[PDB]
Amino acid sequence: DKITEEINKAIDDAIAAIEQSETIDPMKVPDHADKFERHVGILDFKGELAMRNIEARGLKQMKRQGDANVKGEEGIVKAHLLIGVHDDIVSMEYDLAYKLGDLHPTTHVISDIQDFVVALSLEIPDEGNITMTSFEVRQFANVVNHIGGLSILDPIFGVLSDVLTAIFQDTVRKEMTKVLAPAFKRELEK
Amino acid sequence: DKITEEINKAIDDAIAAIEQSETIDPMKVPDHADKFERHVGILDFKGELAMRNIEARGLKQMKRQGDANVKGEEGIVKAHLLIGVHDDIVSMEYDLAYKLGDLHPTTHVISDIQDFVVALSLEIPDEGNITMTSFEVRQFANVVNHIGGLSILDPIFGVLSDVLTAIFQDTVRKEMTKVLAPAFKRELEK
């Protein structure tokens, strides 16, 4: 209970420190190119896309999703925690170029990452270096792709949207993990 | 986008209708007993437990996590939705009897289900009747078990907590889906 309290405090303080530094909102994400192919009822959509100027906004709203899950295990405390965003979606903004045959338009897009959650684990020996032991951005359960000037009924939208989501689940999630993990680790492990 | 706003609104209306239902909050969960075995190390824990008077609270705070994820595919509008709880946890209370050796205490516990979320899918033909084509209570990302009278440092805590968490992931999730899924289906399908 006192231990739960102080772990909660370590986490909140680390969150505050990270939010304070800026660095994290907006967060830059490296460009990413990908190739797509889908057959959709007598129609074929095969081509290529490029995302540039990708920025994640909203992590300034990060907050603990509740008490730490804590168990004393043989003279070492083990804690597991959720940090999500609170007062927003996490918003991804970027320029999109794609190619389909002779068409190669560009537009801008906002992608909504719903229920962004970081799961992290800690360890505390009776003395006494708090060690962060795992850090992961959970799988995005729902991503909404607002592709500038593209109607959602346009058969190509569904193709582009599904590809962008897969890219977010794979490429972008792992990049966000690579940025967030050392930041929390330096704050916690002090 | 109007189609999205329409789908959002149907979801918002169904949530409101379901939130007033009763049997939703508090929701009863059938009694459950489990014979468990956990290996921690050197020590080894075989035993049994029984949960009774299980009640889930907080579902009256259900709310969409953002826009419906919407796209047209082959003349069908397809929508994917995330519904969580806003300004609350989902909290489970219950009586707990457990047995380890002829240790056989009884107590009461509060379990915190963090980031409780339901994901659902809809299809909307212009033909055409709206069907809910999927519904899932997502894996709980973190559960905090507050077991009356029992210290987080007590070696028996970690064991019961882990067993209770597995029961939540399996039995409790299934039981909540049993209540929620046909309630949403009924609302959304007329």
Author numbering:
A (entry chain B), B (entry chain A): 6 to 195
Task: Share the article's original sentences.
For decades, the house dust mite has been known as a major causative agent of various allergic diseases including asthma, atopic dermatitis (AD) and allergic rhinitis. The homologous allergen, Der f 7, isolated from D. farinae, is a 196-residue protein with 86% identity to Der p 7. Here, we report the crystal structure of Der f 7 that shows an elongated and curved molecule consisting of two anti-parallel β-sheets – one 4-stranded and the other 5-stranded – that wrap around a long C-terminal helix. In Der f 7, Leu48 and Phe50 are in close proximity to Asp159, explaining why monoclonal antibody binding to Leu48 and Phe50 can inhibit IgE binding to Asp159.
We purified a Der f 7 construct (Asp1 to Asn196) and determined its crystal structure by molecular replacement method. In this isoform of Der f 7, residue 130 is a Pro instead of a Ser, as reported in other Der f 7 sequences; the other residues are identical. In the crystal structure of Der f 7, the 11 β-strands are arranged to form an elongated, curved anti-parallel β-sheet that wraps around the long C-terminal helix, α2; this is compared with the 10 β-strands in Der p 7. The N-terminal helix, α1, interacts closely with the 4-stranded β-sheet and the C-terminal end of the helix α2 to form a hydrophobic channel, likely for ligand binding. Superposition of Der f 7 and Der p 7 showed that, with the exception of the N- and C-termini, the only region that is not structurally equivalent lies at the loop between β1 and β2, which harbors the largest conformational difference between these two proteins. Notably, this loop contains the linear epitope residues, Leu48 and Phe50, for the mAb HD12 that was found to inhibit IgE binding to Der f 7; these mAb epitope residues are unique to Der f 7 and found to be replaced with Ile48 and Leu50 in Der p 7. The putative IgE epitope residue of Der f 7 and Der p 7, Asp159, is located at the start of helix α2 and in proximity of the β1–β2 loop.
